[PDB]
Symmetry: D3
């Protein structure tokens, strides 16, 4: 009778809510009034209005946002009949080609639904060709069974969603109104190849000579950052973190994250050879 899409919607779309600050979608994940959405939906208003698909409206309190992840948590007070809940899936089970259903509640009285698949898997955003629109953003992304596997964002036609397993790791902290830790050092960085460095040094108009190595080229030192304060300059080649050699910027990020906030890291750089200690700080 019903397609599998209409069925998944029937499972999880009741709990998809409209969110208005004076706008987008979110979804209730616990009978106690915990609601997930995007930071772009709510921030920086601390007061929102939630509307259930059934037309019940609630005074929503923004519990906190994490701009780095584009996630926020809103709480409402469960009065009267029980709040419908969307069941959460696991995004680590996704495969490219899995069905993907994007549900909004932009009006408050019905769901908006679009269908597509998982297009890419890496925030490590899920990519999908399920059309993602305003108002549909901040709503859930379901798998074929109707479980939440992600949170739509309005970021072609390809759309991005925050994997659910990332929200599930951040949810406690955001509900408590705390700051999610995001350590960084503040450089735009690029993996540099020796063929790329010799190629660079052949060009009379490259901005700077590069020491013909496999490394992490500092492309830019962001203002106000630990990297600027440590004295790092554009054109520096990062050759290793403390001891371990590196040629991959993505690996450097993971070393900085595993360090934590307010940790000193020692960097091996070429400018000459130069070691500098950077104090990780919170990305803002």
């Amino acid at each position: 009778s019903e397609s599998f899409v209409a069925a998944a919607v029937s499972r999880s779309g009741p709990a998809v809510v409209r969110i208005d600050t004076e706008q987008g979608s979110g979804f209730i994940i616990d009978n106690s009034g915990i609601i997930l959405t995007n930071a772009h939906v709510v921030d920086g208003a601390s007061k929102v209005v939630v509307t259930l698909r059934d037309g019940r409206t609630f005074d929503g309190q923004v519990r906190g946002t994490d701009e780095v992840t584009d996630l926020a948590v809103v709480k409402i007070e469960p009065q009267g009949s029980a709040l419908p809940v969307a069941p959460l899936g696991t995004s680590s089970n996704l495969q490219v080609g899995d069905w993907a259903i994007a549900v909004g509640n932009p009006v408050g009285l019905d769901n908006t639904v679009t269908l597509g698949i998982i297009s890419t898997l890496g925030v490590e955003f899920i990519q999908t060709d399920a059309a993602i629109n305003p108002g549909n953003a901040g709503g859930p992304l379901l798998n074929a069974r109707g479980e939440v596997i992600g949170i739509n964002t309005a970021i072609t036609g390809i759309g991005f969603a925050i994997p659910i397993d990332q929200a599930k790791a951040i949810q406690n902290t955001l509900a408590a109104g705390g700051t999610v830790p995001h350590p960084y050092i503040g450089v735009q960085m690029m993996n540099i190849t020796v063929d790329q460095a010799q190629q660079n040094n052949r060009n009379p108009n490259s901005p700077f000579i590069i020491p013909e190595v496999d490394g992490i080229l500092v492309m830019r030192v962001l203002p106000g950052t630990p990297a600027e304060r440590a004295g790092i300059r554009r054109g520096d080649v990062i050759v290793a973190v403390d001891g371990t050699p590196i040629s991959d910027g993505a690996r450097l990020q993971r070393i900085v994250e595993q360090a934590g906030l307010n940790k000193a890291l020692k960097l091996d750089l070429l400018r000459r050879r130069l070691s500098l200690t950077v104090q990780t700080a919170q990305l803002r």
Copy 2:
């Protein structure tokens, strides 16, 4: 062998025609030469050319259009072999998430087909993420079985279709060349909340003070309308139709429609308190 899409197409795509005035698609709904399409396809030409998927061309007479609904009826003369017919479904059975197939015949010799789902259900347009293109517009929107459930229009990526059950109510009148009745009074109107009226009255630069009530705020009086002729002004709050209180613009529309053409309605308004009688007229 064939997917369900290819099957539905085989059922109803024979009857999808190309329409040219010197362009878009339509479909034959009766063996006697009755064809449905959009008003935007044909109007305001009274003579079109119809081409069947099989390459037979016919001199088409536009029987009439309804611009308010975006619907038109074209008739051809069934000579020779029988005209293929698309079977009509029922749009009141649709659910969000149901499959949706948009078929055109822009060239005249083959169908254009796109696949998506029903995205929203409210003209109360069907929304679909089945890509709707020029030339594909005015063609049918099928369900998974191949029955017509709507009429594509070229109005993201989200597309709009006129539900079939609306055409089926208008079809006799348009085929006879009559005017479909569309009574209105000629106001852009907005539901006003007391928190919205107090919020409005807090702003030194709101255009006008609003009497702090739940009502229908007149946002604009359209020129040449029954509302202008009755003396209604921007900033009037409609408080009730005759007797019945109202705070919903959508409800006012339904009262005006249920009235009919050339009917006097009594409006309760705040400007002071003021009653005015409006004479419904045909929307054009």
Copy 3:
């Protein structure tokens, strides 16, 4: 467990490669290192870099391109473990409405996948509503079983793909570095109807009077072509090829192709009545 999309991807996505000249996708079609892609991906670089989904990189030699078809062949040297291969389907079995899966490898370490259907069938491009993006272009278009039925191009939302059976006819020639033959004469041409010619001649501002016939109107003589060299002018009506009457430009194309390169064709034209011989030349 896996949808049919995820399964087809598992079948053929291993062989989808990233292609970089200093960018797009291609796919290995033979264990000996033969790779297909678009001409737009590679041309006019004769050296590219191929990356398999598994992260193995190869020094790719562009074997040749055919700009008219938008096809190119790249060869790599199969060292070590065997190159994964995508199985080729047959595009003459496609029907509109058949599922269509567009696979890229833009990064080199994973597939990009989008889902849609066959939208049109006529280069006679496959049209699909499977979203086709940069980086996803030059990759394969699969059927529901995972066989290659086409080659994506970045040419709405509707996308174009080169049918596989066309590549399969060109592949030997391109791999050998030869030129695919594309004979033409160099006219923009239009089928002219007597109602269209009388309609034209009614307009005081038509550029030229047309002899009120069914023919092939020469709309433009391209510079440097066999048609310019034969003396053909804009406004000429082609009435027949040698002996056979013609009113269809598409038929004229097929007569010129069946002729071959450096073949004289005799054209019957109205300007007066005038016969001219054109020497087919290679389209560039």
Copy 4:
């Protein structure tokens, strides 16, 4: 003490008025309330408001406009103190390089003045590099002595002015509310040279072959005109008016004007050779 500009302004700027319909400048040319301005200033309002530099306001009646010349006449009722008057010069005495002073009264309480020279002399517009602005348009253009030699228009930096001697020929008719005669036939026409016709006929993509002559090529037949009604077509070469040969479009214009309204002219044309009679009509 005063430059010659300030002196000319003192002479004629009192009579420069502001004109508002709910805007631009004009000037009083007779103590009885006759005011000149542009058609663009006033049309198509029949009621304007005039303001003298001294702040006196008058209810102005538009007496008529001539859109072809961009001239209009406004009348006011001289009550109280006498209306200041600008003295009229003669534009046939102008030479290129003569000083030119453009005066407006956009506000109503002061003049706007700009200085430049006569740049070109051919409506046969005076060109000047005296900056001509909105509000300054419709005001007078003075010579170094302060006499009106033209009427500014807002048509680089080069500005256009209607020569005074043209207004002086139209003024009686416009004041009486009559229509100024402007006979025409309705063709965009071009002088054609034999080198230009042979050059044209060499181009395979010229719209039409031209009979290799010195003539008046009809470039376009305007819709609704005497030329369309006479059957003239684009690509016709006009070879002579009745009897007199012609190769100059500007000469043809003067023959049509000297004819008058509703006069039959016989045209010698090449299409073949063809004579057609055209009935001059009023340009609108």
Copy 5:
């Protein structure tokens, strides 16, 4: 030998300086290092570099700016040979049509000079058609004798200059680093006519009914102003200042200025009839 322009330049152009913060022109008005320019040239840098036409460079201290007037004063230390000085004229002697010469020193080693006239006389800006360019802005505007009558700004082709007599009234205060007083109340205001109020009240879509009077219509209440704090709303009609009736916004401005800073004014308003006291504050 020299035109009068070249002579005036020789008189005052020596003292025209280039001003750079890391740009525009200024001029020395006193042998002690006092320099005038625009606020837009310098603000908000407190340190600039001055260059004399002779190539001497000085470390300039910005003494203060008045953004409302677009004026600033820069001081340098007169070492060595005496600073050249431009003599100041009087702008109250200007007449429209007087010659006007705009001098810059954008490079530092020569003057830029343009010639035009005084176009309008009302900050009450001088308008001129002497071309005013970047780098030429902040330099002096001379009369035919070479005296400074204004200060160019880069605010068609019409240019604006600050009259010298306004600078001369502000110069002491700016040199001392004080704030020039600019009292205001914070309303966009419009003179309203009874024909304009009846015309307004005829329009069903005017934002508000106007009490059919000659007054000062409050068009907007600027945020953060004395008018917002006094409770004035858009659509209020100001009928009088304390006691004196008013229908002219320009007159209200002069009453507020003559009041001074931190003065209470009583306003007669229609909304009903309503009196409100406003506390003048400094325009920023």
Copy 6:
């Protein structure tokens, strides 16, 4: 009777010609048919048509162009009545503020004239606020007496003219069809200050560290130039030509010009310290 502008025009405007290749102005400078104009007017056509203000047309031969100066020489054959000639002035006598008159002949039958002054004096272009338009470009720029002091170009409102004394130095060579020598080395170069180099080195994102000196910073090495072939790189600081120190790019240009074509220059550079020999080549 006539202003001084009309008089200068009468002196030199007869010799101002229209130039068409299938457009702009030029002027006859010798009774033997020598005509000056801009390179932009004619190049790269070797055949033009000249029209005298009196309506005589001549077959013009382009004798050569110098793109670096924007100058060209056209020759015609003096048949019949004598060619009118414009007398040449001397641009080294110009002063800023001197009157300047720009004359064109765009139509062929009259002059276009605009008036302004000399705005700047440095190709070392004359700047003027005499409006310079298409068609007026390539015509002469006169002084108040009517002598040619420059050649208008269509390069605000400020216009550029080539000083006559530069043409007079190039004229023989261009008339003979030779190449004017323009030696260069091919660097975009900038005077660098120690405060600018320390300022640069403070910025973490400057492309390169600069050795804290007064020099000539190489900003860019143009492709295909003597500088690229000598191995000069972006970021090099030129410290001296052979022996003589330099901190001024304009001085370096004059040393290269005084060298001539195909001369070796020795450059002192910082990169380290480095000397390189550059072979001057012709600027193209």
